[PDB]
Each structure stands twice: as structure tokens, then as C-alpha cells.
């Protein structure tokens, strides 16, 4: 369904935020 | 549908937050 | 509809958060 | 409606988070 | 209604996050 | 109701995030 | 119910974010 | 159900954000 698909797109965007924060941890080290 | 479309706009905004955080990681490097 | 409109306002606020974080990346560089 | 109104209050709170993050970018500059 | 009331509690918690971030901006200055 | 109760648990978790951010502001001061 | 259970899992994940931020406050001090 | 499943994917993504923030706390220590 379209709502479930849109919520999955929100989860994928939150994973992108996690990847960006992992890169910030590498920059700090 | 309009609710699914609005949730997709929220996903796009969250991706913009990830892009901005990547810019911070590059600034620290 | 009113719910879709309110979710679009949430997306616009998340874009404002992204813009603020982009400014933080410029400040770090 | 009360749900739409509550979602608008969430959008306003997210805008307050953006304003606070802008204050951090100005402090770093 | 109970759902609207719970969403208002989420908005109040997001305002608390904004206040904490404003304090971080004062600490950076 | 169980949905309202779960949303209240999300509000409480967001307040915990605010408390943690206040600890960061105090560490910077 | 399954939706209430999934929202409780979101609250637990937000608590994990708070714990990670508390650790960052300890690192800054 | 598909909505509950999508919300569980959002919880998992939020846990990934917590893991990334823990990596930042370790980098600061």
C-alpha cells in the first residue's frame, strides 16, 4: 500500500541521517 | 493519495537533513 | 485536506532544520 | 480539527528546533 | 481527545529539545 | 487507549533526548 | 495491538538516541 | 500488517542513528 511505502521511504531517509552521523564520527577521530 | 504524498515530502526533508549533516562531516575533515 | 496540509507544514519545518544545519557546516569550514 | 491542530503544534516545535540550531551556527561564526 | 492530547505532549517534548539546543548555542558563545 | 499510551511513551523518550542535550550544554559551559 | 507495539519500539529507539547523547555529554566533560 | 512492519523499519533506522551517535561519543573520548 501507498502509506506503508511512504513510511518505508521515511525509514530509508533516517538511515541516510545515520550514515551522515557515522561520517561525522570518522571526521572527529 | 494526499497523505502518502505528504509523507513522501517528509522523507525528502529528512534526506535534506542527511545532506546537511554530510556537509558538517566534510567541514570537520 | 487538513491532515495532509499539517503534514506538509511538518515537512517545511524539517527543511528549516536542514537549512540551519547547512549554516552550521559553513560555520565549521 | 483537533488532530490537524496538534500536528501544526508539532510543526511549530520543529521550527523552534531550527531557530535554536541557527543560534549554534551564529555562535560558531 | 486522547490522541490529540498525546500529540500535544510530543510537541511540548520537541519544545524542550529546542530549549536544550538554545542552551548549547549560549555555551558555544 | 493503547495508541495514546504509546504516543505518550514517545513524548517521554523525546524529553529524555532534551535532558541529554542539556547535559551537553553544561559540559560546554 | 501491532501498531501500539511498533510505536513502543520507536519510543525504545528514541531512548537509545538519548543514551548515546548522554555519552557524548560525558565525553565533552 | 504492512503499516506495523514499516513502523518497525523506522524504529530500526532510529537505532542506527543511536549507534552512529555512540561512535561520535567514542571519537570525542
Residue numbers in the entry:
A (entry chain A), B (entry chain B), C (entry chain A), D (entry chain B), E (entry chain A), F (entry chain B), ...: 1 to 29
Paper passage:
αHBs are oligomers of 5 or more α-helical peptides that assemble into coiled-coil structures with central solvent-accessible channels. We targeted two properties of αHBs: oligomeric state, which directly affects the internal diameter of the channel; and the identities of channel-facing residues, which fine tune this dimension and introduce different chemistries. The αHBs are loaded with an environment sensitive dye (in this case, 1,6-diphenyl-1,3,5-hexatriene, DPH) that binds within the channels and fluoresces.
We introduced mutations at one or two of these sites to generate four groups of αHB: Group I had entirely hydrophobic interiors, but with different sizes and shapes of channel; Groups II and III had polar uncharged or polar charged residues, respectively, at specific points along the channel; and Group IV had aromatic residues installed in their channels.
